[PDB]
Amino acid sequence: GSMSSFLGKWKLSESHNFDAVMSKLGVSWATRQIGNTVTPTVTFTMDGDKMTMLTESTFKNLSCTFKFGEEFDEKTSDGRNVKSVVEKNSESKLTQTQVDPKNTTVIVREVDGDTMKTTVTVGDVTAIRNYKRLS
């Protein structure tokens, strides 16, 4: 219920054009390289009206918890302090916009069966990241 398809765990399987989006984010060379190697595992759980998305890689394990529509501060993996809002588009889709003062990153995550497609957009640049559902 409310993001039922999002519940559970997810491992990255493919990433296309990701160095473009986060060169544009000014992510350092070194953190970008790690971004291009590691395959995070994100977990969602819905807990009442608050959803939590945990990301686990060898780099960092970050997690954050949000109401939909409700702005909230966040530290990104790379280290930018951003103001985020996650909107519910549908039951199989949500959209996390991330505002720092240099750029705004929009992150569409969309569940379709065993795939969650994560589209990441900074201005005119776009990367797509697919996660295969675990178990």
The residues that touch ligand ACD, with contacts defined as CB under 6 A, are 21-22, 25, 27, 31, 34-35, 38, 40, 42, 55, 57, 59-60, 62, 76-78, 105, 107, 118, 120, 129
| Residue 19 vs residues 15, 48, 66: alpha-carbon distances, Å | 9, 36, 27
In the bound state with ligand ACD, the residue whose beta carbon lies nearer, of 46 and 117, is 117
H or E element in which residue 134 lies: none
**Cβ partners under 8 Å of residue 29, min gap 6:** none
Smallest gap, in angstroms, from Cβ of residue 131 to ligand ACD?
7
Smallest gap, in angstroms, from Cβ of residue 91 to ligand ACD?
19
32 is known to lie in a ligand binding site: no
109 is known to lie in a ligand binding site: yes
CA distance 134 to 89: 23
Smallest gap, in angstroms, from Cβ of residue 51 to ligand ACD?
14
60 contacts 78 by C-beta, under 8 angstroms: no
Q: Residue positions in the annotated binding site? A: 109, 129-131
